[PDB]
């Protein structure tokens with residue numbers, strides 16, 4: 001449903 | 010944080026209003 | 038938010054999002070109270086009947102957002118939480134008395150055109166603004182209509198919603214519920230005779246309930262979306278956490294833990 005955020009967050 | 014709180018950069022600081030703001034004010 | 042509308046870009050620069058890492062999902066709303074402290078509702082973090090007791094590393098705080106699902110690259114800012122401070126006398130067993138929790142960020146946030154804090158009320162602003170009849174503002178990415186019946190259709194906003202609500206008399210609040218109400222809460226909503234609609238709903242929790250000061254055109258947060266029975270339902274109001282009354286606690290933790 002949501003858009004993937006950076007792996008480092 | 011405090012001291013400059015409550016002032017929106019795109020509104021209060023540009024002497025600009027948001028579509029429903031006066032509704033608030035006039036209810037007072 | 039039921040029967041509200043889309044928020045304007047940068048209209049609510051204090052709106053914060055509690056986003057769970059795994060699974061990845063919106064948990065609740067919140068509000069920038071400073072560059073390192075966020076105010077949310079105790080029940081977003083602690084609620085046994087539903088098996089919730091999140092830890093600091095369990096989630097993320099995303100500020101600057103407008104869109105609900107979109108990762109808005111150089112606009113939003115995701116920060117990690119260091120510690121979480123919930124009210125010691127919070128009551129999830131009975132009435133949600135003292136539904137308040139403060140969260141401390143690892144690193145201070147960089148204010149921008151989209152990120153800015155909200156003021157906290159004070160005795161005179163509280164006294165002259167918290168009046169039955171006066172309108173406030175609620176923001177959140179919660180439900181568009183009560184989770185129920187044969188709701189055919191979406192039911193989720195794509196962009197941040199907003200709705201202006203009037204404060205109701207205490208006598209009228211206590212009488213719409215069989216639930217024990219305390220001074221640490223207050224309700225808002227159109228009375229039946231108004232024949233109008235609008236409300237917060239599931240997913241809007243911990244979200245700010247604000248008012249504009251006519252005496253310093255500044256925004257103060259007066260309440261925290263806490264609870265209700267249904268959404269936008271006839272003859273029922275929505276209860277918010279009385280921020281000014283819990284302020285004594287708010288000061289104590291901040292000025293002691295950062």
Ligand SMILES: N=C(N)NCCCC(=O)NC[C@@H]1CCCN1C(=O)[C@H](CO)NS(=O)(=O)c1ccc2ccccc2c1
Nearest residue numbers: 131132133237238239240242263264265266267268275
């Ligand atoms: N403004 C609104 N109309 N609704 C807002 C609901 C906010 C919310 O999601 N709150 C969560 C608490 C905890 C989880 C259950 N709960 C509720 O408010 C549910 C949410 O739909 N309502 S309720 O009628 O079932 C209810 C249930 C339990 C309660 C326990 C303590 C206090 C109030 C309660 C109210």
